[PDB]
Structures are given as structure tokens and as C-alpha cells.
Amino acid sequence: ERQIFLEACIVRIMKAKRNLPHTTLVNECIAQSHQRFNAKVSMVKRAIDSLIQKGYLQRGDDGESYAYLA
Amino acid sequence: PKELTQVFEHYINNNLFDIDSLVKFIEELGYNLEDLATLCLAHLLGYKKLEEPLKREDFLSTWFMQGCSTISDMQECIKTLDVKLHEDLQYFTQIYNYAFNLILDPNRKDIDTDEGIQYWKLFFQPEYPVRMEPDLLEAWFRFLRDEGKTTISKDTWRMLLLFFKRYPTIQKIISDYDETAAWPFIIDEFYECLQ
């Protein structure tokens, strides 16, 4: 129910970085992602979906990258 | 071209080329509104959303661009598009993606699974450019209706194409599908659904 830190984390990384490869962010996020506890690569993925749907991220053409929208 | 402005003037209702006039027009050409060819036609005339009116200047402009002046010419044109949809993977993809917004309700951000499946049944037919075992497509539908997924998002939609392109067999999935990848979570649930 609290995958929320995760969404918070992604946008923090995506705002500063502005464009990453899926794997990079999915792990780079996990890096400074644990620390409050371990999170399965499943979980970080659902966050991306949540942000993709909210309007924060736009998936790159190739299908394996994310871009931070306005 | 007088014929063009004559045709457009034939299917008009209350001074408009609305949805009911498009229906009466494609049917004369030999099709149905639900067909992939209509997606092709819609895309050519540059529709943005299906029920939205078509401007004269728009109709007269596209038809002349091609080199049609008769119904017989128009009918001929679409048939080429429909065929291109079966032979050119670029066009197939380009139209697959274009379909979502057209099917999509402006009073919404997703389409209902009901409406999506309809178009999937046509898009992923054995005959078409993205060849796949009919058993898989049946799988995906079974999963969609069981796990109670009622709506599908543009992302999922544009991603399922890339997915079926890599995996044509329930077999090849269980084999190497890698759940640590960009495939939307929804696909993973499907992947976990296999067994």
C-alpha cells in the first residue's frame, strides 16, 4: 500500500536526470531505493507504470527508456 | 474537381459530413465502420476522433491529392491501403498506434477492454504481418476477462504490439520472457498467468 516512497523516488531521480534507460533507473532507483527496506524489481516497475499514467513519465520510442515530462 | 465536391455533397446530412455520413460513405465502398480499412481511411483523411465532423476542404483536399475523382477510384484507393495493412509492417504499426486515439473517448484516458479486444481480434489475425499462434491471442483475452482488467491504457496498448512481435508463442514466453524488463506490469501478470 506504500509503494509511494518509490514514486517519490523515481521523479526525484527523473527530474534531476531527465532521461534514462529502463534498467539504469530501475536499479539506480533501487540503489538509493532500499534504505527504508528492500524493494523487489517488481515494485519499482509498478511505480513507473503509476507515473507513466499520472503524466510524469513518457516512454521513449524504442520502448525501453523513460523521459521526464514538464 | 466537380465530381469531388459532388460526392461530398451526396453524403452530407444537415450541411455536415458527420459520423452518420461516414457510415453511409464507407458502406457504399463496401466496408463497415469497425473494419481496419476504415482505420486506414480515417487516417488518410486525417481524422482525430471518429465521430468528429469532416471539413469539406479536408475531403476535397485528400481525395484530390491521391488522384481519385470517382467512387470507383476511392474504393480502389482504400483497397490498396487495406492491402498495405497486410503487407507493410511499417504501415501496420503506424495504423495500430493511430487506432487507440480514434477508438479512445475524449471523456477518458483509457479505452475499455471490451473495445480493445474487438480490434485485437482483427489486428492479430494469423494472416497479418505480426504472425502469432491463435492460441496466444486467446490466452491474452482469457486473462484480461478473468483478472477483471476492464480498461487498457495507451502505453499498455502500444507496448503489447512490441511484445507480440518478440513473442509469437505461449512457448517462447515461458522460455525466455524476462520479467525484469520494460514490459508494463500488466504483461508480467499475464506471464505469471501462464501455467
From Swiss-Prot, chain A:
* Covalent cross-link Glycyl lysine isopeptide (Lys-Gly) (interchain with G-Cter in NEDD8), where: 15
Domain spans labelled Cullin neddylation: 1-62
Subcellular localization(s) per the UniProt record: Cytoplasm; Nucleus
Q: How is it modified after translation?
A: Neddylated; enhancing the ubiquitin-ligase activity.
| Comment field (misc) | Present with 377 molecules/cell in log phase SD medium.
Role of this protein: Core component of multiple cullin-RING-based SCF (SKP1-CUL1-F-box) E3 ubiquitin-protein ligase complexes which mediate the ubiquitination and subsequent proteasomal degradation of target proteins. As a scaffold protein may contribute to catalysis through positioning of the substrate and the ubiquitin-conjugating enzyme. The SCF complex associates with CDC34 as the E2 ubiquitin-conjugating enzyme. The functional specificity of the SCF complex depends on the type of F-box protein.
Q: Tell me the subunit arrangement.
A: Component of multiple SCF (SKP1-CUL1-F-box) E3 ubiquitin-protein ligase complexes formed of CUL1, SKP1/HRT1, RBX1 and a variable F-box domain-containing protein as substrate-specific adapter. Component of the SCF(CDC4) complex containing CDC4. Component of the SCF(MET30) complex containing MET30. Component of the SCF(GRR1) complex containing GRR1. Component of the probable SCF(DIA2) complex containing DIA2. Component of the probable SCF(YDR131C) complex containing YDR131C. Component of the probable SCF(YDR306C) complex containing YDR306C.
Family assignment from sequence similarity: Belongs to the cullin family.
| Record's protein name | Cell division control protein 53
User: According to the record, which residues of the full protein are present here?
Assistant: 746 to 815 of 815
Curated annotation (Swiss-Prot), chain B:
Is the keyword Phosphoprotein assigned to this protein?
yes
- Molecular function GO terms recorded: cullin family protein binding; protein-macromolecule adaptor activity; ubiquitin conjugating enzyme binding; ubiquitin-like protein binding
Q: What does this protein do?
A: Required for neddylation of cullin components of SCF-type E3 ubiquitin ligase complexes. Neddylation of cullins play an essential role in the regulation of SCF-type complexes activity. Does not act by preventing deneddylation, but rather facilitates neddylation, possibly by acting with HRT1/RBX1 to recruit the Nedd8-charged E2 UBC12 to the cullin component of SCF-type complexes.
Transport among keywords: no
From what organism does this protein derive? Saccharomyces cerevisiae (strain ATCC 204508 / S288c) (Baker's yeast)
Q: Which UniProt keywords apply?
A: Phosphoprotein, Ubl conjugation pathway
Q: Per the record, what is one GO cellular component? A: ubiquitin ligase complex
As recorded in Swiss-Prot or TrEMBL, the protein's gene is named DCN1
Full protein name: Defective in cullin neddylation protein 1
Q: Which residues form the DCUN1 domain?
A: 1-195
Choose any GO biological process term that the UniProt entry carries and state it: protein neddylation
